[PDB]
Amino acid sequence: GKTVLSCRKGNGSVYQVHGHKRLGPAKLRILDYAERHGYMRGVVKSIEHEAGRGAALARVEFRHPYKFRRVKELMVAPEGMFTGQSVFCGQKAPLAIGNVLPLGQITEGCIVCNVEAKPGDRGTLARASGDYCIIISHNHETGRTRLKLPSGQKKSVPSTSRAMIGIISGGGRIEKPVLKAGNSFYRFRGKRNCWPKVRGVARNPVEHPHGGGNHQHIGHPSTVSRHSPPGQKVGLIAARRTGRIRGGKAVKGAWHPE
Amino acid sequence: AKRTVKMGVMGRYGTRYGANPRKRAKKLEVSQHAKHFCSFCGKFAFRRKAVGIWRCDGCSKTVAGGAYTLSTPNNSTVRSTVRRLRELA
RNA sequence: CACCAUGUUCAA
RNA sequence: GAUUGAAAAUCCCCA
RNA sequence: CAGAGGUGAAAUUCUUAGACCGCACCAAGACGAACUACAGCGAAGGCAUUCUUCAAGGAUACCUUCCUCAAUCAAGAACCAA
RNA sequence: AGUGGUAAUGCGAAACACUUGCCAGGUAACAAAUCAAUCCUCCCACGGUGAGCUUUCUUUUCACCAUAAUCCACCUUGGGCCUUUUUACUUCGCGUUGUUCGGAGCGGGGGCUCAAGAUUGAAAAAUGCAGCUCUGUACUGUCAUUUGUGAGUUCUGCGCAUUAAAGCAAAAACCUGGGGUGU
RNA sequence: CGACGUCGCUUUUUGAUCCUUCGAUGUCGGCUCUUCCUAACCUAGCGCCGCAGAAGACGCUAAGGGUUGGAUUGUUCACC
RNA sequence: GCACCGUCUAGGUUUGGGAGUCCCCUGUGGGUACCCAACCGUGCUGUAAACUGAACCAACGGGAUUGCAGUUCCGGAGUCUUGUUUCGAGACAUCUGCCAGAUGGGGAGUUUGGCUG
RNA sequence: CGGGUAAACGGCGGGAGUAACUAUGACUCUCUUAAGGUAGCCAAAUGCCUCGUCUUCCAAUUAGAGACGCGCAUGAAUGGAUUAAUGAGAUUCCCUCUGUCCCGAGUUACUAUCUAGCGAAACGACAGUCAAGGGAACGGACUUGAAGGGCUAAGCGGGGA
RNA sequence: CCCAACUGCAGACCGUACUCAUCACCGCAUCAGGUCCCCAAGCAUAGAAUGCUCUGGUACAUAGAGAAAGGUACACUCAGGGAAGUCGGCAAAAUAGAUGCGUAAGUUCGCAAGAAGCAUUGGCUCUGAGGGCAAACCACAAAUUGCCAACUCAGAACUGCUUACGGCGGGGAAUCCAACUGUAUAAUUAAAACAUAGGUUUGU
RNA sequence: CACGAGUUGUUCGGAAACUGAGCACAACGUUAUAUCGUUUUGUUAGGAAAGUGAAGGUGUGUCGGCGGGACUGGCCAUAACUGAAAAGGGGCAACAGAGAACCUGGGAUUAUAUUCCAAAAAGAAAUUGCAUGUGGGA
RNA sequence: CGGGGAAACCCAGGUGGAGGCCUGUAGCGAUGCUGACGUGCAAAUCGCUCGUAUGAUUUGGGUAUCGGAGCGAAAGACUCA
Ligand SMILES: NC[C@@H]1O[C@H](O[C@H]2[C@@H](O)[C@H](O[C@@H]3[C@@H](O)[C@H](N)C[C@H](N)[C@H]3O[C@H]3O[C@H](CO)[C@@H](O)[C@H](O)[C@H]3N)O[C@@H]2CO)[C@H](N)[C@@H](O)[C@@H]1O
Ligand SMILES: NC[C@@H]1O[C@H](O[C@H]2[C@@H](O)[C@H](O[C@@H]3[C@@H](O)[C@H](N)C[C@H](N)[C@H]3O[C@H]3O[C@H](CO)[C@@H](O)[C@H](O)[C@H]3N)O[C@@H]2CO)[C@H](N)[C@@H](O)[C@@H]1O
Ligand SMILES: [K+]
Ligand SMILES: [K+]
Ligand SMILES: [K+]
Ligand SMILES: [K+]
Ligand SMILES: [K+]
Ligand SMILES: [K+]
Ligand SMILES: [K+]
Ligand SMILES: [K+]
Ligand SMILES: [K+]
Ligand SMILES: [Mg+2]
Ligand SMILES: [Mg+2]
Ligand SMILES: [Mg+2]
Ligand SMILES: [Mg+2]
Ligand SMILES: [Mg+2]
Ligand SMILES: [Mg+2]
Ligand SMILES: [Mg+2]
Ligand SMILES: [Mg+2]
Ligand SMILES: [Mg+2]
Ligand SMILES: [Mg+2]
Ligand SMILES: [Mg+2]
Ligand SMILES: [Mg+2]
Ligand SMILES: [Mg+2]
Ligand SMILES: [Mg+2]
Ligand SMILES: [Mg+2]
Ligand SMILES: [Mg+2]
Ligand SMILES: [Mg+2]
Ligand SMILES: [Mg+2]
Ligand SMILES: [Mg+2]
Ligand SMILES: [Mg+2]
Ligand SMILES: [Mg+2]
Ligand SMILES: [Mg+2]
Ligand SMILES: [Mg+2]
Ligand SMILES: [Mg+2]
Ligand SMILES: [Mg+2]
Ligand SMILES: [Mg+2]
Ligand SMILES: [Mg+2]
Ligand SMILES: [Mg+2]
Ligand SMILES: [Mg+2]
Ligand SMILES: [Mg+2]
Ligand SMILES: [Mg+2]
Ligand SMILES: [Mg+2]
Ligand SMILES: [Mg+2]
Ligand SMILES: [Mg+2]
Ligand SMILES: [Mg+2]
Ligand SMILES: [Mg+2]
Ligand SMILES: [Mg+2]
Ligand SMILES: [Mg+2]
Ligand SMILES: [Mg+2]
Ligand SMILES: [Mg+2]
Ligand SMILES: [Mg+2]
Ligand SMILES: [Mg+2]
Ligand SMILES: [Mg+2]
Ligand SMILES: [Mg+2]
Ligand SMILES: [Mg+2]
Ligand SMILES: [Mg+2]
Ligand SMILES: [Mg+2]
Ligand SMILES: [Mg+2]
Ligand SMILES: [Mg+2]
Ligand SMILES: [Mg+2]
Ligand SMILES: [Mg+2]
Ligand SMILES: [Mg+2]
Ligand SMILES: [Mg+2]
Ligand SMILES: [Mg+2]
Ligand SMILES: [Mg+2]
Ligand SMILES: [Mg+2]
Ligand SMILES: [Mg+2]
Ligand SMILES: [Mg+2]
Ligand SMILES: [Mg+2]
Ligand SMILES: [Mg+2]
Ligand SMILES: [Mg+2]
Ligand SMILES: [Mg+2]
Ligand SMILES: [Mg+2]
Ligand SMILES: [Mg+2]
Ligand SMILES: [Mg+2]
Ligand SMILES: [Mg+2]
Ligand SMILES: [Mg+2]
Ligand SMILES: [Mg+2]
Ligand SMILES: [Mg+2]
Ligand SMILES: [Mg+2]
Ligand SMILES: [Mg+2]
Ligand SMILES: [Mg+2]
Ligand SMILES: [Mg+2]
Ligand SMILES: [Mg+2]
Ligand SMILES: [Mg+2]
Ligand SMILES: [Mg+2]
Ligand SMILES: [Mg+2]
Ligand SMILES: [Mg+2]
Ligand SMILES: [Mg+2]
Ligand SMILES: [Mg+2]
Ligand SMILES: [Mg+2]
Ligand code: NA
Ligand code: NA
Ligand code: NA
Ligand code: NA
Ligand code: NA
Ligand code: NA
Ligand code: NA
Ligand code: NA
Ligand code: NA
Ligand code: NA
Ligand code: NA
Ligand SMILES: [Zn+2]
What Pfam families has UniProt attached to this entry (chain B) (predicted)? Predict the structure, then answer.
């Protein structure tokens, strides 16, 4: 046999990110002394689009806390961010859309985005267009905050981890039918080399477990074990269930009783 | 005079892609190409310049909101909630 | 509150 | 013929 | 701790891997009991916890205004439980 | 140790000078279609020089009629802006071929500025080309010495500028300012 | 014409066999074209009949000459 | 047991004490309204709806060598370190090696009788 | 061992009787599965029988179309059915058109053909007229007969298995 | 020491011929194959279609003689019939531009559609229409007066055809398959295969 | 085939001297063995990779100002003691991207020319680097 | 810009220039003749004809990914006949 396509992509090569024309990683500003004790006020200078990202990006200009210069951070703009808006970031920042506050300072039931999974990680959750997290509750005894992630899972994080008030801009993108293969071609131009997609049954058996046969068919069950080696782990990986879901979509992902 | 009975802007696609996919795309396409009210400057001059990016031809303000409309209903709900929670504090 | 289905055609 | 008020029905190639 | 459920009687079902039952909670989606009436409101369909709000609507009151501006209606329009 | 203009913004012979201590912007730096379109090309009229044809026609046919950079001085078109008048939109006006615009300042008057040209000279006839004259010279005197509301042409007007779930490289180098120095 | 039986011929069918060919003999049908065979369809003669005539059956000598156009099917074949 | 290491504060509230409105003309310019203690607070000069200003290379005040300029330091800009850059986790695995097992056509090697009209 | 899961792989029955002519079987009995093929669709690019049967198309149709369904062995994201537009895709008929054909004829350029110059390859046991006979069962050599004067040019595809 | 207008001196290194192809590169070769960029005239015409032409380039690609059969062709024609040929309309024929009229079933309302069909077209001599430019607070037929460029369309009379360059769709009624545009076995398979948007499921 | 000749640049192309998709020296780690890996998401390496230098103190020279060529507050250059500030090593990769100061005329060739032309350079320019003098300031 | 209408809205003329839209060059391909050639011009070419030709478009240079591996809109295609 030969290496399966899913294994080949792990080598990198021609399947890596088309990072040219991207503006750079989008993040909150560094959790410095000013954020931990007071606040830093910035100004939104531009709202920009980056190839491969549905959400709009905001360039926010701050003064350097220690030097005579400016910083010009780049963040994922929440819905409603506008040029000239004042962005407040810190412990003492007021509760308003676009401001960055510690989670412990944000009232329960609020809608947040750009949530730090770890304090100081500069935003790792609720970043894709139209997504948000919901603050469930605060637990001061352990200093944790419970959140509802966009996928539906509930996650506890330290209350010093920051979040941005609002929802990610650009929501509703997936509601418009593509209607053309060419539009998908342009969609994936800025992301990576992963389109078009050839079905495994259309390939030959040398390069895919589903290949071959005098009829186009998978001759074995497509649910494969979690422990299957690469090259054999294709199809529905470790599926707890299959078939059309009826009577309610359960929350996907791993089960965390905590 | 009217040039199409019901297709409207989708008539550039001819007979392709199906009626229902055309209808669903049309609602969002009209919205994304339409002029939207600007709360600043009080004009109907907001136009999209990229997915999620809107610039007002009147006051030149740029606002990040909505893939195909200036503001999504979820954002309106979030705006009221944040204002209410801010008053509560 | 277990289970009760049916009655050939005219005409007295 | 039995019964009936009269009847039904019933009985007495290769490639 | 040994049954529970369900029925005319049963069985499908749940249960020592602790069901049913008991207490205080938590989550989520519906619903707004009794009060509820030959009672109210609405053009009909319909409408029932509280508080804060946004436009209405009828009736009543008037020595206000006005001056026939009305009634009913093919076509046409809007609404319409499940 | 700059200076004028109500303003848009103007002024250069060397104090309007130094700024890689530092800071901030700009140039470099990118983009459809429609419509106008540059240099040049082609075609028409116009007039010279030579050549072709001329039983018969043809005030004819053909060729040519060129001005490189670098500079000086300073009417047309398009854009941005300033000042003035704003009683500019009550059952409105300006403008494009074209999907616009205006009390967040339209139109009218008068101005400032930018971008393309046009024009004036210096360069520059001393050059180039053709014809022709005379005397054996690759000799020598001399004469010729522009019009188009035509058709093309992406230079340009032209971008926060194209379909877009597509939104269209970067840097060196350079420019200007903020501060400070001069003080 | 010929049951029950019985004796043959033919190689225009299939089968049986594996002698020749696996350092290869191009494997279906049609088209085209020539020739040969006779167990004779037509054509030339001749017997015989349950041969009146007409139309036919059977048989003899004879292969000189002739033996088609089309629909469906790749078809040979089949059918119209 | 006692003492030493061991020291200070924005702001908020309430307890004691001392001690200095004026020029020019109704208006303008300049300036004064303090210090300490106790409790809370914990390092705290700015924002509580958001539409785009500017912030550097110290002013100033003290202690020594009237006012002024020099050379020093010290404040302005608190002090300290049984020490960890900070945060999160934490003696488990999200870690490291070994031993042991299960799974494992993802992959390797090999095999897949004979007689035979 | 105990649960879940088919838009996971996949799967989705047989026999007997029965209605006042006859036939047919709404109906009934019985054996049995994890479930016994539902909505649809079809002699379909899926039907062995098969050139199925009916209708239509032609003078004549193993073809085409429309129906029928005992479906050797149709069938639902192993996707079922339908489908305007689109297609160098597979099929049938009609109009137009014609040398495709009845049935062949004439013309042209370049060849072949002849010449000047130039000048190969494949192939080559030896060779090269037939009939029959035997033979390794299909001879150019052998047996017996019949032919055969020698050397050349252009063709041709019977043989040289 | 900083400037302005001059001026004086000095401005190093490598590449530079020729070719870029029906002979200079690759394909064994001066091989009808392959190979990126710039400049691109006149006429007809919608024109970078196609035909011919000034400038530039060229007659280089073995030739001569010359109606045998049979061939090849980026060559034609054929009376009467018209697919009877053939597995099969293969091949060929046919349709043809522009303008006006007219156009069925079906349909996702966009199409189907150039559906199908009918008619006109030359030459010549005229007529009409479509403009630019310039000029003496009321209202004022500059609602006329001159001069002029570049073209198009329409309508008439007369007079022709041998239907006559090039270039340029045949059409209709149905069945099967794939939605469509695309991709794809370089050198026998271009399709119904792959992709596609859409739909669903899984892991996180 | 033989012999003899031809390619002339301050401005044209490249380089000196930009970044791009990328490459991988150092550094570190790995491997029995480096002939392996990391090395642009602002960016090497547990990582001390800056030799550069603002304001100053010390001498020389060029100056403006006062007082009596020199003498002191003040300016600017020249060498030396410190010492603000600068985080992220060294390079390659575009002859179509960025960048780039020259144009015509010619009788100047058998062949090179925006490359050759010499005092009437046929000539007209542009742009560098150092200098002198003139003039204006310090 | 007109024409209807009580209203909601509808009808007609022009302007405009959209499309993995159509005809058709260059370009990029390769259907049929099962044509030519088949010791060829050619170890895949030639002719007519044909697909497409504003896009999932064609192309230069540079750069990146290979040998039980690379790459593949998937033909076991392609990785110097
Ligand atoms: N350290 C060796 C490297 O491990 C990598 O692979 C390792 C990881 O993929 C994987 O590590 C997993 C980790 O994914 C997962 N998130 C957690 C799990 N505990 C780890 O497991 C590993 O680490 C633990 C240490 O406690 C060991 O006990 C265990 O044996 C080991 N398999 O286990 C593999 C074996 O260690 C490389 N693929 C491999 O080539 C290389 O050998
Ligand atoms: N609704 C589903 C139920 O199943 C029934 O199914 C019926 C049929 O579909 C089925 O019969 C089979 C079927 O299994 C199979 N898949 C196809 C076969 N052709 C059918 O056969 C049936 O249908 C054809 C057509 O009319 C008849 O000619 C035939 O006589 C009849 N036996 O079995 C039942 C025969 O009575 C009916 N669809 C319907 O009446 C009933 O409600
Ligand atoms: K092991
Ligand atoms: K295995
Ligand atoms: K089946
Ligand atoms: K098409
Ligand atoms: K013999
Ligand atoms: K002829
Ligand atoms: K319809
Ligand atoms: K394919
Ligand atoms: K491909
Ligand atoms: Mg990458
Ligand atoms: Mg696919
Ligand atoms: Mg395949
Ligand atoms: Mg396999
Ligand atoms: Mg398979
Ligand atoms: Mg399939
Ligand atoms: Mg399948
Ligand atoms: Mg009764
Ligand atoms: Mg109640
Ligand atoms: Mg009424
Ligand atoms: Mg309902
Ligand atoms: Mg720009
Ligand atoms: Mg660029
Ligand atoms: Mg107005
Ligand atoms: Mg343009
Ligand atoms: Mg017998
Ligand atoms: Mg044998
Ligand atoms: Mg053999
Ligand atoms: Mg042999
Ligand atoms: Mg043979
Ligand atoms: Mg005989
Ligand atoms: Mg005979
Ligand atoms: Mg004979
Ligand atoms: Mg720690
Ligand atoms: Mg194996
Ligand atoms: Mg054997
Ligand atoms: Mg009976
Ligand atoms: Mg059942
Ligand atoms: Mg069937
Ligand atoms: Mg069939
Ligand atoms: Mg037929
Ligand atoms: Mg049928
Ligand atoms: Mg199913
Ligand atoms: Mg199937
Ligand atoms: Mg096709
Ligand atoms: Mg031999
Ligand atoms: Mg013989
Ligand atoms: Mg022999
Ligand atoms: Mg032969
Ligand atoms: Mg040269
Ligand atoms: Mg040269
Ligand atoms: Mg060339
Ligand atoms: Mg060649
Ligand atoms: Mg070679
Ligand atoms: Mg013309
Ligand atoms: Mg041409
Ligand atoms: Mg032409
Ligand atoms: Mg030649
Ligand atoms: Mg030749
Ligand atoms: Mg004929
Ligand atoms: Mg006919
Ligand atoms: Mg036929
Ligand atoms: Mg026939
Ligand atoms: Mg026939
Ligand atoms: Mg046939
Ligand atoms: Mg044909
Ligand atoms: Mg119709
Ligand atoms: Mg298709
Ligand atoms: Mg289909
Ligand atoms: Mg196409
Ligand atoms: Mg296609
Ligand atoms: Mg092939
Ligand atoms: Mg093929
Ligand atoms: Mg092919
Ligand atoms: Mg030589
Ligand atoms: Mg790079
Ligand atoms: Mg990296
Ligand atoms: Mg590091
Ligand atoms: Mg370089
Ligand atoms: Mg360049
Ligand atoms: Mg240069
Ligand atoms: Mg010249
Ligand atoms: Mg000359
Ligand atoms: Mg030359
Ligand atoms: Mg197209
Ligand atoms: Mg096309
Ligand atoms: Mg190519
Ligand atoms: Mg052939
Ligand atoms: Mg041949
Ligand atoms: Mg031949
Ligand atoms: Mg295969
Ligand atoms: Na199977
Ligand atoms: Na319990
Ligand atoms: Na004005
Ligand atoms: Na044999
Ligand atoms: Na006879
Ligand atoms: Na049957
Ligand atoms: Na024999
Ligand atoms: Na030589
Ligand atoms: Na010179
Ligand atoms: Na080409
Ligand atoms: Na590898
Ligand atoms: Zn606005």
Answer: Ribosomal_L37ae (PF01780)
